[PDB]
Subunit: 132 residues, 2 copies
């Protein structure tokens, strides 16, 4: 199956770091990761048009998984959805999961599974460490 | 009360990025970007954690945030290497690295430690389902 992970944040440093970390761990051999942090010029902030353009510039045969950390990243991920065509919304998935851990979980299970329900469930389960 | 936020990943970019993002939005919290190896490559460095605690004051709570399995293992080894007096101020926070750290730095601005960790522990949900 065809999957992309879209990483939204105020910080381009965070999303580049996630992408680089996952790729170097060899965890994204079966998934495309887009670093979408920052405004149009690298500034701290979020632009929904990065998501829109990314979806518009990609092939139509992808499932698009959207992770955000906080704030306007979250808002930008929600506002982008409402901007898409109907065909595109059916392929757009807001993943209720933490940014780093959700994405890594989505990525590592796509190298294991053809099943978007399971790819989505793993991420949604991700943030904890067995800690206190 | 006096909380330090310590940030552990393979990735110095991520922990630098999180540190810079917290600071640019929020005062009296010391944040440690401890992602990466000693020369900065992708990997873990438990000694940096131990150093950090040893260099710090004795009147501070250390909130450890990690992302993936290797950083988690490394943070746990760090704790295991500390003195019993130091261990009592060292808190492995069961939270998402990015959202967990932000929630805690925000909440600490509370003197209730139970609540600083609680907000961190329930961080990372978007209301998206």
């Amino acid at each position: 199956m065809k999957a992309d992970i879209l990483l939204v944040s105020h910080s381009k440093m965070i999303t580049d770091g996630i992408k680089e970390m996952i790729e170097q761990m060899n965890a994204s051999e079966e998934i495309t990761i887009h670093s979408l942090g920052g405004t149009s010029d690298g500034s701290l902030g979020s632009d929904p048009m990065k998501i829109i353009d990314t979806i518009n510039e990609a092939d139509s045969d992808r499932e698009f998984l959207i992770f955000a950390d906080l704030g306007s990243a979250v808002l930008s991920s929600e506002l982008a959805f409402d901007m898409l065509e109907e065909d595109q919304q059916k392929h757009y998935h807001l993943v209720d999961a933490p940014l780093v851990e959700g994405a890594f979980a989505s990525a590592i299970t796509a190298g294991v599974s053809d099943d978007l329900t399971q790819i989505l469930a793993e991420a949604q389960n991700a943030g904890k460490k067995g800690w206190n």
